[PDB]
Amino acid sequence: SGFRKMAFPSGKVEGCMVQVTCGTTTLNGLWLDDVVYCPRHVICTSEDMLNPNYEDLLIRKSNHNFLVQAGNVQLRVIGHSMQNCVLKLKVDTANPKTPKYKFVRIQPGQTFSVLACYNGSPSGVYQCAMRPNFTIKGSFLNGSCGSVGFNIDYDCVSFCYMHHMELPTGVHAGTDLEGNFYGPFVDRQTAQAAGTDTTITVNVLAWLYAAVINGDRWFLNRFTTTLNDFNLVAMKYNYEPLTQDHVDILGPLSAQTGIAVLDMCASLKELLQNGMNGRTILGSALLEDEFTPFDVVRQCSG
Amino acid sequence: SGFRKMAFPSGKVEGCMVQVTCGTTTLNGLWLDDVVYCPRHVIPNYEDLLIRKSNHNFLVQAGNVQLRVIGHSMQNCVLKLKVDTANPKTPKYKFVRIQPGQTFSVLACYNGSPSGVYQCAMRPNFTIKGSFLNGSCGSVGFNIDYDCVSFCYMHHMELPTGVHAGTDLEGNFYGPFVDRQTAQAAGTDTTITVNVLAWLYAAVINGDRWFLNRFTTTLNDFNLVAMKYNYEPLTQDHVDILGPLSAQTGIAVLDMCASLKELLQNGMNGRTILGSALLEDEFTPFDVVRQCSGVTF
Ligand SMILES: CO[C@@]1(C(=O)Nc2cncc3cc(F)ccc23)CCOc2ccc(Cl)cc21
Ligand SMILES: [Cl-]
């Protein structure tokens, strides 16, 4: 029993964190085999950030301009190349602690763990979700750039995020491990704004099924809804549209509890209308949206 | 910016998790040097049950490798299995007993394999509001200080309300619990006041000030109010511990106490603090300073 926001064990990722220094800039790198991946803005100055020409800044650098530190050991850089917004530094030593891994690009609504690091040293781990506006509500201070997001399935680490910037509202923007940003963001100090955020409807529904699995049913009602009527009401509260894919994904949880997706949708419509009336759902007074249907099955069923 | 419930990196603890099997029971063990620590209920009269057992009755698995037991002894509610091999991944460590209100990270394991990590606080009623399923027994709680892992908790049982009970690594229970199937209940819980105040300072540091007011209070008047709302009494020690956060934000501890009194008496009025509609009490003053500054391990 119990329901917590759980992060994946960070050990396999800790053994990959290194410190990358270029001139006066120090940030984090991900050392996998003989390559160190880090944000390409490590080559920029604060002035360069307004309108950086990364190709022109990189052509003026040599291998020995990049200092890479793994623990108390200096790695030797033997090559460098750019792939979108990530810099790939070829090193002379393969990481002996390289886990089984893959680079995956996630969609909004998907969750992942973040290992927050400063000076190549991990300081903490927390669980996140890619918001519908492509930002993450993380906890990052200066020097956390290059910190990574991941999931672990079986013995395989799936890297899905690398931290690059903090937006004016306090939210965070970054790229996949191929250097493609999530969202309409650029690694430029431009007037960039997150976009109006919405609630991940499929995740709130999954969390409502997790409350029913843990023995809480006070929010259920005798009503149903069509998918269209549910979406007309959901949009009025800034909830993401629920698609037929979302209804399909909730099938296993519907079969386990005996509550049809559209009947759980009717309960969500009523919660939006009435509020909780001093009650909580799984220790929360807000409707939780950072647990996917897959996370609920993993934490509850085994 | 940002404020999340952050756990310590679990790597140093992952390299110590093993599976312990005795008869039909399978649970988790902590392998440090040549000893494996696990709940004694893996085997009531535990010295009479233990005296029957031989070393080969305990099956210990570290990954896909079997460790052979060469000795066994009991320390309170913890069984210590002497193994033939010292763990080469043993970190720098110490066993520490924590007080209610203090927080720690939990590496939840099943069959000697870690599945997740989360942060939690020792409640005033000595229970933990964790997330544990069957097979999680022997999972451990810890803090990391520099390069040193301080083990403070080992999971033993779930109570009928869904909360959890366990021991320190010397086998002494936190709370009035016993490792036996009997009618045991979690006592009436209270809110950790010093932690709520620390979380209010973390909100001010992150730019949330709507709850601040021009008023201050006395420690006595605040405690008369706090006792009415099932909040733990705030001591002079608590006020002292909140000194650095008070100096950083410019808000005196009894000034922040007056803001907490208004939130208890009037609610949030449709508003939130750090994305929450409830007053959060599972962040200590030290966690707030560590997260809003940047300490690494
Ligand atoms: C070079 O890093 C920038 C940045 O957003 N850094 C940060 C990243 N994470 C957390 C942060 C927390 C802070 F308190 C301060 C800065 C943070 C600084 C501002 O301009 C830019 C413009 C674009 C890009 Cl892709 C990066 C940056
Ligand atoms: Cl995805």
Q: Which ligand is nearest to the CA of A47?
A: 1
B172 & B206 share domain = no
DSSP-derived 3-state class of residue A234: helix
Which amino acid would we find at residue B157?
A: M
Same domain, A129 and A265: no
* Spacing of C-alpha A245 from chain mean position: 21
Bridge partner residues of A181 (DSSP): A175
Domain boundary among B26, B56, B91: B91
A210 and A133 in a common domain: no
Residues A185 and A202 in one domain: no
Beta bridge partners of A39: A86
First to last CA, chain A: 11
Query: E strands of chain A, at which residues?
Result: 17-22, 25-32, 35-39, 66-70, 73-75, 77-83, 86-91, 100-103, 111-118, 121-129, 148-153, 156-166, 172-175
Contact call for residues A203 and A250 (beta carbons, < 8 A): no
Q: Are A277 and A219 in contact (CB under 8 A)?
A: no
Count up the domains in chain B and report the number: 3
Residue B176 CA to residue B155 CA, distance in Å, equals 15
Q: Residue of the nearest CA to atom 18 in ligand 1?
A: A165
Resolution (A): 2.0
- C-alpha A281, offset from chain centre: 24
Atom of ligand 1 nearest to the CA of A85: 25
Residue B294 tokens read as 């940047």
Q: Which atom of ligand 1 is nearest to the CA of A185?
A: 25
Parallel, antiparallel, or unpaired for β B113-121 and B103-110? antiparallel
Rounded distance, CA B14 to CA A110, Å? 25
- Asked if B215 and B255 count as a contact pair (C-beta separation under 8 A), the reply is yes
Q: Which residues of B are catalytic?
A: 41, 137
Distance A106 CA to ligand 2 centre (A): 4
CB A208 within 8 A of CB A254: no
SS (H, E, C) chain B: CCCCCCECCCHHHHCCEEEEEECCEEEEEEEECCEEEEEHHHCCCHHHHHHHCCHHHEEEEECCEEECEEEEEEECCEEEEEECCCCCCCCEEEECCCCCCCEEEEEEEECCEEEEEEEEECCCCCCECCCCCCCCCCCEEEEEECCEEEEEEEEEEECCCCCEEEECCCCCECCCCCCCCCCCCCCCCCECHHHHHHHHHHHHHCCCCCCCCCCCCCHHHHHHHHHHCCECCCCHHHHHHCHHHHHHHCCCHHHHHHHHHHHHHHCCCCCCECCECCCCCCCCHHHHHHHCCCCCC
Distance A8 CA to ligand 1 centre (A): 26
CA A272 to chain centre: 26
Structure tokens belonging to residue A33: 């085999």
Longest dimension (CA), chain B: 69
Cα–Cα distance, B127 to B159 (Å, whole number): 9
The answer to whether the beta carbons of residues A74 and A68 sit under 8 Å apart is yes
Residue B7 contacts residue B116 (beta carbons within 8 Å): no
Q: Give residues (CB < 6 A) around ligand 1.
A: A 41, 49, 140-142, 144-145, 164-166, 187-189
Nearest in space to B108 (alpha carbons), one of A284, A2, A149: A2
Q: How far apart are CA A302 and CA B116, in angstroms?
A: 12
Amino acid at site A154? Y
CA angle, residues B264, B269, B272, in degrees to nearest 5: 85
Do A117 and A190 fall within a single domain? yes
Local structure of A113: helix, strand or coil: strand
For residue A93, the 8-state DSSP code is S
Q: Which residue has the tokens 């650095």?
A: B244
Task: Measure the CA–CA gap between B8 and B117, rounded to whole angstroms.
Answer: 9
Give the phi and the psi of residue B281 in degrees, each rounded to 5.
-125, 20
Q: Is A164 helix (H, G, I), strand (E, B) or coil?
A: strand
Q: Which residues of B touch A285 (CB under 8 A)?
A: 276-278
Cβ-based neighbour number of residue B74 at 10 Å:
15
Check whether residue B251 and residue B153 sit in a common domain.
no
Catalytic: A128? no
Cα atoms found within 13 Å of the Cα of residue A291, Cβ hemisphere only:
22
Mutating to test ligand 1, I would choose from A164, A171, A182 the residue with most ligand atoms within 8 A of its C-beta, which is A164
Count Cβ atoms below 10 Å from residue B182 Cβ, excluding itself.
7
> Which of the listed residues B24, B58, B91 is the one where a domain comes to its end?
B91
Distance of alpha carbon B69 from alpha carbon B83, whole angstroms:
5
3-state secondary structure of A129: strand
> Within this chain, do residues A189 and A290 fall inside the same structural domain, yes or no?
no
Q: Rounded CA gap, A215 and A2, in Å? A: 10
Strand pairing class (B148-158; B92-95): parallel
Q: Cα(B141)–Cα(B137) distance, rounded to whole angstroms?
A: 12
Query: How far apart are the C-alpha atoms of B276 and B272, rounded to whole Å?
Result: 5
The position carrying tokens 């309108």 is A51
Q: Are A127 and A113 in contact (CB under 8 A)?
A: yes
Which residues partner with B114 through β-bridges? B109
Tokens describing residue A243:
């698609």
Q: Which atom of ligand 1 is nearest to the CA of A39?
A: 25
- Which residues make beta-bridge pairs with A35? A32, A90
Same domain, B9 and B105: yes
Is the distance from CB of A113 to CB of A125 less than 8 angstroms?
yes
Cβ–Cβ contact B2 with A under 8 A:
yes
Whether B213 and B204 have beta carbons less than 8 Å apart is answered as no
CATH number at residue A51: 2.40.10.10
Mark whether A41 is an active-site residue.
yes
Query: What's the Cα-to-Cα distance from A68 to each of A17, A20, A164, A210, B37, rounded to whole Å?
Result: 11, 5, 18, 44, 39
Residue with the two structure tokens 């993401």: A240
CB B142 within 8 A of CB B8: yes
Gaps in chain B (C to N distance exceeding 2.5 A) after: 43
A218 and A183 in one domain? no
Residues A217 and A81 in one domain: no
Is B138 in contact with B20 (CB distance < 8 Å)?
A: yes
Regarding whether B281 and B166 lie in a shared domain, the answer is no
Q: Are residues B219 and B197 in contact, defined by beta-carbon separation less than 8 angstroms?
A: no
Last residue of a domain, one of B91, B111, B135: B91
Residues of A in contact with B202 (CB under 8 A): none
Closest CA to A41 of A31, A56, A32, A52: A52
**CB-based contact A4 B130, cutoff 8 Å:** yes
- The CA-CA-CA angle for residues A80, A82, A88, to 5°, reads 50
Q: Do B100 and B181 belong together in one domain?
A: yes
Kindly give the pairing relationship between strand A156-166 and strand B35-39: unpaired
CA atoms within 13 A on the CB side of A270: 16
Q: Which residues pair with B92 in a beta bridge?
A: B148
Structure determination method: X-ray
- Tokens coding B30: 């902590």
CA distance B280 to B154: 25
Greatest CA span in chain A, whole angstroms? 69
Range of the domain at B66: 15-91
Residue that is written with structure tokens 């850089």 in the block = A77
CATH number at residue A227: 1.10.1840.10
Give contacts of A140 with chain B, Cβ < 8 Å: 1-2
On the CB side of B126, CA atoms within 13 Å amount to 17
Amino acid (1-letter code) at residue A187: D
- The neighbouring-strand residues paired with A118 are A121
Q: What are phi and psi of A234, to 5 degrees?
A: -55, -45
Query: CB-CB: which of B14, B129, B131 is closest to A11?
Result: B14
